[PDB]
Design a protein around this ligand. Sequence first.
Ligand code: HEM
Ligand code: HEM
Ligand code: HEM
Ligand code: HEM
Ligand SMILES: *C1=CC(=O)N(CCN2C(=O)C=C(*)C2=O)C1=O
Ligand SMILES: *C1=CC(=O)N(CCN2C(=O)C=C(*)C2=O)C1=O
Ligand SMILES: [Zn+2]
Ligand SMILES: [Zn+2]
Ligand SMILES: [Zn+2]
Ligand SMILES: [Zn+2]
Ligand SMILES: [Zn+2]
Ligand SMILES: [Zn+2]
Ligand SMILES: [Zn+2]
Ligand SMILES: [Zn+2]
Ligand SMILES: [Zn+2]
Ligand SMILES: [Zn+2]
Ligand SMILES: [Zn+2]
Ligand SMILES: [Zn+2]
Ligand SMILES: [Zn+2]
Lengths: 106, 106, 106, 106
Amino acid sequence: ADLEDNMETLNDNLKVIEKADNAAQVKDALTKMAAAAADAWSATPPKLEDKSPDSPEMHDFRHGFWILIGQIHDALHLANECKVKEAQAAAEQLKTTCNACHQKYR
Amino acid sequence: ADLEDNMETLNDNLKVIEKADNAAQVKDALTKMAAAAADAWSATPPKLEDKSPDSPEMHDFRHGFWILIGQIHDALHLANECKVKEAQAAAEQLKTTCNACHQKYR
Amino acid sequence: ADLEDNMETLNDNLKVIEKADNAAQVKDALTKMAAAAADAWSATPPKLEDKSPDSPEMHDFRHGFWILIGQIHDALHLANECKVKEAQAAAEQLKTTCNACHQKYR
Amino acid sequence: ADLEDNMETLNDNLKVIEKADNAAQVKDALTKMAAAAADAWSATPPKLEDKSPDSPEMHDFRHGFWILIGQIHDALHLANECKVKEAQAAAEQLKTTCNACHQKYR
Ligand code: HEM
Ligand code: HEM
Ligand code: HEM
Ligand code: HEM
Ligand SMILES: *C1=CC(=O)N(CCN2C(=O)C=C(*)C2=O)C1=O
Ligand SMILES: *C1=CC(=O)N(CCN2C(=O)C=C(*)C2=O)C1=O
Ligand SMILES: [Zn+2]
Ligand SMILES: [Zn+2]
Ligand SMILES: [Zn+2]
Ligand SMILES: [Zn+2]
Ligand SMILES: [Zn+2]
Ligand SMILES: [Zn+2]
Ligand SMILES: [Zn+2]
Ligand SMILES: [Zn+2]
Ligand SMILES: [Zn+2]
Ligand SMILES: [Zn+2]
Ligand SMILES: [Zn+2]
Ligand SMILES: [Zn+2]
Ligand SMILES: [Zn+2]
């Protein structure tokens, strides 16, 4: 999958999580988010097509994904404990990371 | 320090960070934040005086601090990297965590 | 709690985990480790009594605790997920963090 | 890149790091390590071709990558901070993660 396309998988699963009823559903939604993040990992964003893979601005772009993945990692443990509402809140809270990268590189 | 006291330290240093000029100032403010968070970890909040240290709400209260500390850890690396504005935004973004716990347990 | 003493709580519970039988035992051992680390957080080590709270060396000493706490945080989730052996391995593996700090500052 | 291929990228850059002189070299090697880890994340290992992507076994295989990635993230901060030797030692210490997974699923 491509960048914008991974981003839509991130967006749709966030919606899936918000609305879910049970631990297995968030389980699965977060799992798909993790894969999408992992895929996005090496992608070059339109805004930075000029920059090299070594620039400060590529390094900082990627860093945003480390944060996201670490946060999906944690939400997933909460899910795996059947702290369903707790996992939804963590899912909701990670929008701060989405936003922080969008405001810089999108 | 007690829990309200640690919270003030957190709120104050956030202000310090927002307004700061150089890396050393942010470094220092985050460092104090990290100590306050570390101290607050063991505390019992008024709202849960009547629950047990082993409660769901106690295990979830504590968890918020691990999030915050992890996020202060990261912002500090940015500061140490002279990515000052980057560190200020990370500082800014962890109000998400502050708020999430306040809504629940304040 | 004073530093060496927190360290002994860290060492004793590591033994406890290594030998445990059930999830609840490891839960409790890791919980106590977490509190010990959180207390140790701000302590000044003998080797650095002449250094300032702001020095590079104090910052780097503190950093080691960030790592330990984040690793205890993770191991705890594994315990809470009834993945007992997985949690014992994670407990076993964070000896690397113990060691890395001892070799520098002990 | 395939699983075995990502593993060699991991092993090679570890060497590169061991032997390095300056921080850009470590920076660059860790960066490549993170991409390899990110790519590997989705892989199915030969030992579990017969289990399902939903298994206890697959969930636990994947978890090891999150650990490794989290550890590469941290070591990279150290590199970015010109704490070269510190970054080398962190690189070295994450062999504990490499080994833990190999003992289990290689
Ligand atoms: C976090 C969970 C997250 C979500 C959700 C998300 C979604 C998303 C949308 C909905 C878009 C709009 C693109 C469009 O054309 O409609 C979008 C675009 C970009 N994002 Fe994103 N995205 C999330 C996270 C992140 C993170 C963590 C980063 C940076 C590390 C990031 C970056 C970007 C970039 C760049 C784009 C634009 C890409 C382009 O080709 O125009 N996003 N994402
Ligand atoms: C995050 C950086 C954070 C900030 C900032 C913050 C601020 C803050 C203030 C200013 C108050 C008190 C206002 C008054 O007039 O008394 C306050 C109080 C509480 N907080 Fe807080 N706080 C932050 C973080 C967190 C986190 C992460 C938690 C839980 C995980 C948490 C909890 C609480 C609680 C409980 C109180 C009030 C308890 C009391 O004895 O009054 N805070 N915070
Ligand atoms: C990690 C899990 C960990 C263990 C285990 C550990 C053990 C330990 C002991 C048992 C002592 C004192 C022996 C006694 O009973 O008298 C001790 C002392 C020190 N440590 Fe340690 N320690 C662990 C973790 C860490 C970490 C993460 C750091 C660095 C940030 C660190 C450092 C030190 C230092 C310095 C001492 C000297 C204390 C003293 O003897 O006065 N340790 N440790
Ligand atoms: C950590 C940085 C790490 C290193 C280093 C590493 C090395 C490594 C080598 C050298 C091989 C040999 C491959 C070959 O046949 O040519 C290898 C293979 C496997 N590894 Fe690995 N590996 C590191 C990390 C990890 C982690 C985190 C896991 C699990 C989460 C893991 C597992 C495996 C598996 C499985 C193989 C075998 C693949 C195959 O032979 O088809 N490794 N690794
Ligand atoms: C979340 C709700 C629930 O019932 N379970 C099962 C209980 N459980 C443990 O206590 C440890 C593993 C486990 O399944 C949940 O995880
Ligand atoms: C803070 C970040 C920074 O880079 N510097 C000065 C020189 N320096 C680097 O540029 C990279 C490591 C290093 O010491 C700061 O003072
Ligand atoms: Zn689009
Ligand atoms: Zn957690
Ligand atoms: Zn106190
Ligand atoms: Zn004040
Ligand atoms: Zn970071
Ligand atoms: Zn002693
Ligand atoms: Zn002794
Ligand atoms: Zn984990
Ligand atoms: Zn590949
Ligand atoms: Zn092979
Ligand atoms: Zn081969
Ligand atoms: Zn191949
Ligand atoms: Zn760090």
